[PDB]
Enzyme design. Structure first.
Site, PDB file in Angstrom:
ATOM      1  N   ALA B  18       0.722  -0.842  -0.344  1.00 37.04           N
ATOM      2  CA  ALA B  18       0.106  -0.223  -0.196  1.00 37.04           C
ATOM      3  C   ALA B  18       0.982   1.059  -0.179  1.00 37.04           C
ATOM      4  O   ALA B  18       1.959   1.151  -0.262  1.00 37.04           O
ATOM      5  CB  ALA B  18      -1.177   0.234   0.991  1.00 37.04           C
ATOM      6  N   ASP B 126       5.094 -10.499   8.455  1.00 37.96           N
ATOM      7  CA  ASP B 126       6.217  -9.219   8.734  1.00 37.96           C
ATOM      8  C   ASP B 126       6.248  -7.840   9.910  1.00 37.96           C
ATOM      9  O   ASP B 126       6.398  -7.191   9.480  1.00 37.96           O
ATOM     10  CB  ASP B 126       5.556  -8.341   7.253  1.00 37.96           C
ATOM     11  CG  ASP B 126       6.429  -7.525   6.452  1.00 37.96           C
ATOM     12  OD1 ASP B 126       7.533  -7.968   6.341  1.00 37.96           O
ATOM     13  OD2 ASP B 126       6.291  -6.836   5.770  1.00 37.96           O
ATOM     14  N   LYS B 128       8.502  -5.851  11.738  1.00 39.03           N
ATOM     15  CA  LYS B 128      10.111  -5.306  11.289  1.00 39.03           C
ATOM     16  C   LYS B 128       9.928  -3.727  12.408  1.00 39.03           C
ATOM     17  O   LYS B 128       8.428  -3.340  11.919  1.00 39.03           O
ATOM     18  CB  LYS B 128      10.477  -4.909  10.394  1.00 39.03           C
ATOM     19  CG  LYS B 128       9.312  -4.711   9.047  1.00 39.03           C
ATOM     20  CD  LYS B 128       9.680  -4.465   7.563  1.00 39.03           C
ATOM     21  CE  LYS B 128       8.336  -4.020   6.444  1.00 39.03           C
ATOM     22  NZ  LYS B 128       7.951  -5.092   6.439  1.00 39.03           N
ATOM     23  N   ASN B 131       7.069  -1.706  10.652  1.00 36.11           N
ATOM     24  CA  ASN B 131       6.122  -1.813  11.190  1.00 36.11           C
ATOM     25  C   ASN B 131       5.550  -1.424  12.118  1.00 36.11           C
ATOM     26  O   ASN B 131       4.157  -2.429  12.722  1.00 36.11           O
ATOM     27  CB  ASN B 131       5.310  -3.276  10.730  1.00 36.11           C
ATOM     28  CG  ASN B 131       5.362  -3.653   8.657  1.00 36.11           C
ATOM     29  OD1 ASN B 131       5.382  -2.475   8.407  1.00 36.11           O
ATOM     30  ND2 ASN B 131       5.575  -4.597   8.836  1.00 36.11           N
TER      31      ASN B 131
END
Ligand code: ADE
Lengths: 16, 329
Positions: B18, B126, B128, B131
């Site tokens: 996105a 995901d 990380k 994030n």
């Protein structure tokens, strides 16, 4: 290391 | 709803699937973040996955929740809660290195969040720095559900090769089937980065991804000796390359094992889950929306959407997207 965390640099890019 | 319901303020990020925007609901002047996905990237049921996870997020404090959901001919839109503290990628560039006390706080809250997804059959996939987002008060939120795998039952496994190479677990690189264990590895890498101020893999932060994969599988990681034995021990426990023996990964005791670790012995987990522990750091909100907490390489971008190419638009099944519109009560 000045450039330790580089947004979307080597190895920090998502992939599938 | 519709794009016209909102005012598009600034670009604030590039997610895994996105482009993330700051928007205001014009009818209310409430502010939200907005994830915009090109249908040309999704048409396995991704939309189903995404909404399934957003559903869990309502009921946990450390997971960003969904306000609403709409579509144009070319794109998907998810209007999510705005978290103006910035993410840990930005925090680390600015802070350089975090004290153990800070890292314990963030990892505790992250553990709660991962464990919450896991108990409901979801691998995050995901985890990380980018994030992990900071609340204005200083608490963390997991965003970006793009790579999530849901519906996973006990003894269920997946084999999909994906994630961010820096954080990709050894079992994935070996091409094994895998479960929740990969999030704990990723958390491992992430804690290492907070306390040592760099990736445990030298080439990251200093050349092909394949070499990175080799380095990950082959090199023994070296913990900075300045770190306390507690901190060191938790890092090697999470960064055990055998998922069978890795911290957090036993099928029955995994979360308890984490909570029982000496590094976390200093944590009142339930006061934590209730956000009653005080964050070690309070983001500075500019008043300008806190846009100061976002990389300028985003905030200095025209908020313009790139017009669609009618060759691709007509050539995508709008049917995989029926009854997508949504509003959270
Ligand atoms: N909900 C969110 N708020 C702020 N930045 C983000 N980046 C990705 N998601 C975000």
């Amino acid at each position: 290391p000045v450039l330790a965390f580089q947004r979307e640099g080597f190895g920090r890019q998502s992939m599938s | 709803l519709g794009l016209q319901d909102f005012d598009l303020l600034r670009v604030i990020g590039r997610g895994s699937y996105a482009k993330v925007l700051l928007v205001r609901l014009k009818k209310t002047d409430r502010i939200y973040a907005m994830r915009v996905v090109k249908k040309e990237l999704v048409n396995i049921d991704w939309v189903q996955t995404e909404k399934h996870v957003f559903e869990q997020a309502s009921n946990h404090p450390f997971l960003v929740g969904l306000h609403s959901c709409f579509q144009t001919e070319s794109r998907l839109f998810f209007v999510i809660e705005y978290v103006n503290g910035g993410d840990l990628m930005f925090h680390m560039q600015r802070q350089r290195k975090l004290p153990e006390e800070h890292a314990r706080f963030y990892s505790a809250e992250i553990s709660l969040a991962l464990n919450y997804l896991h108990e409901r059959g979801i691998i995050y996939r995901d985890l990380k720095l980018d994030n992990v987002l900071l609340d204005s008060e200083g608490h963390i939120k997991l965003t970006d559900y793009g790579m999530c795998k849901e519906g996973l039952r006990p003894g269920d496994t997946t084999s999909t090769f994906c994630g961010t190479p820096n954080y990709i677990a050894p079992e994935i690189l070996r091409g094994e089937d895998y479960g929740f264990s990969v999030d704990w590895w990723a958390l491992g890498v992430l804690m290492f980065e907070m306390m040592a101020g760099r990736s445990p893999f030298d080439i990251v932060g200093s050349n092909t991804e394949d070499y990175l994969f080799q380095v990950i599988l082959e090199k023994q990681i070296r913990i900075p000796r300045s770190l306390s034995v507690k901190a060191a021990s938790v890092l090697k426990s999470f960064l055990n390359k055998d998922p069978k023996e890795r911290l957090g990964c036993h099928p029955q005791t995994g979360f308890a094992d984490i909570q029982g670790h000496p590094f976390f012995r200093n944590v009142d987990w339930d006061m934590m889950e209730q956000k009653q522990v005080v964050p070690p750091f309070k983001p500075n909100i500019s008043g300008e929306f806190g846009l100061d907490n976002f990389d300028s390489q985003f905030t200095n971008e025209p908020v313009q959407l790139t017009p669609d190419d009618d060759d691709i638009v007509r050539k995508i099944d709008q049917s995989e997207f029926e009854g997508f519109e949504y509003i959270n009560p």
